[PDB]
Amino acid sequence: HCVILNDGNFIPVLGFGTALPLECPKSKAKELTKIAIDAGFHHFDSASVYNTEDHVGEAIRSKIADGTVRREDIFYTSKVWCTSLHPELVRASLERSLQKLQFDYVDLYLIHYPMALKPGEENFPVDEHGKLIFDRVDLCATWEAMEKCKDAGLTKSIGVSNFNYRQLEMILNKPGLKYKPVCNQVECHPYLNQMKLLDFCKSKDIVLVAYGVLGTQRYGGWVDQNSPVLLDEPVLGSMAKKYNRTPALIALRYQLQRGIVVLNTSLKEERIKENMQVFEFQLSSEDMKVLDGLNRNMRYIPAAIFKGHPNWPFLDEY
């Protein structure tokens, strides 16, 4: 179950996310990755900032060793963090991730946010007032660095995450562009269906990869704990009954039928296995319209600590 990226590479349409809530020990990522592989997942999403890469890598290499899967069958994504967006620091970060993973290459590498922060070991550098220290970096220069990573063979494909319409256009119209971003990984679910951004990406052969498909893991420090819980939406409960599935399966299927590559995370083995059942049924055209009606501009992860940054992506309509 894959789709073809604009650079010719194949990406599985359903991927398991390896970000873990703060309350979880990082080693948890290793057990979950194993469980996911056994359940049939071949696409895994990670990032330098998650700090789960080494554990995810051990799980994968472990499943490759015992002959469960081959590296070529696994699609692994990483992301360069805000502190290494400087053109001279991008490749170093990728090489560091590859060292942690003990991998020869990653299948996809993305710019995590179009917002650079002060370079340094600390992922969240703050001043004496506790405010993040922003940095100015030419995003087009950063993209050129990403392209060089692809030409180095360190990553098979390159893309971006949390970019808005104008920022994507900035890259697409860049003089001397060599490789278009293969995707734009953003938050997307019934409460924030991204209709406009999705149509734009499609028109440019850019795949929209969605996180927050099930309402996000509601991370402390990022998601308002008082925001509504997506899966508690009555409409999803009613539709789950109609199709004799679950609210989660309904939300997952909704995105797949819109041409979106879906990410998902669960700390529970039973749910990891359940989510694979999304390929078992079809939502009717009319029910897809019903789900479209839930749109209410509810953004669970507005990256509020970045407010004020010149490149904060969520101010524009899309």
Next chain:
Amino acid sequence: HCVILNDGNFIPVLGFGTALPLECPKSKAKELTKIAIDAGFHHFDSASVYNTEDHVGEAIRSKIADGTVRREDIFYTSKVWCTSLHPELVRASLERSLQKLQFDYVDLYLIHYPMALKPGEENFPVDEHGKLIFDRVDLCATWEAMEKCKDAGLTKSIGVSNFNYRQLEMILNKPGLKYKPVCNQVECHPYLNQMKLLDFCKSKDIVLVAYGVLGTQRYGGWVDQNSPVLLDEPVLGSMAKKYNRTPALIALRYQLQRGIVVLNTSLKEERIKENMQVFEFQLSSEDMKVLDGLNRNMRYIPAAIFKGHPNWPFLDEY
């Protein structure tokens, strides 16, 4: 590589057609079906009027018997001809086909044309002037018989072929309707892209299955021999070069990227194998637009001998 029908069943998106030109011995169907199976084809399209069902059935059963494939992995389609549309004759025709195939069930059964003809052994009954003898049979009455065939387990799914927008509506609005048609098999290629009918079918959860994807086999007595040869289209040649593929592969991929289930036939082993490579590449969004521009209302199989029939489907815009 399947899509989900509105009755829950799965259908492979690429199917091998078993209709043969008059110039071919019917037995040719047996060897071609075996070759298609070896190449990876699981979806086979046939019809009682083709007179190749017993040969196709023999090929499939031979491959099932030697362990190459399982019946459950094969998706076989048959169609009831105009002379058996009467409610009292539909089932007998399907049972007759099952007898020829030595199958217990077919996966899909279609009304071949929305035009009933005088009942009898002859598939093309004509009067003393050589004109087809039409018959009056309510399309909804015929559909009820199709539903009964599905309930009897003789066919897993039911659909139609060569129906226009209004005829589909007739079935969809039928009082007491039990099962919607899962598909509408019609001619479709860059010269007749069926944009409007396709959108209508999608809005009703009806899959559009296309034949004539490569310009049809240009059957004598049905297709104008001087009509342009689809694959000789310069645009397809240019695109084939750009993608390092072939005109045929470009035409096949075009339909797949539009959510269409594609049928294809070649009397040559090398081409049957080649067509399976359609899953290897992606046509850009921009090139898809260029192909949409080739539309010129060129209908290779207008069923001209049927002109005059009250239900001739090709007069309406769509």
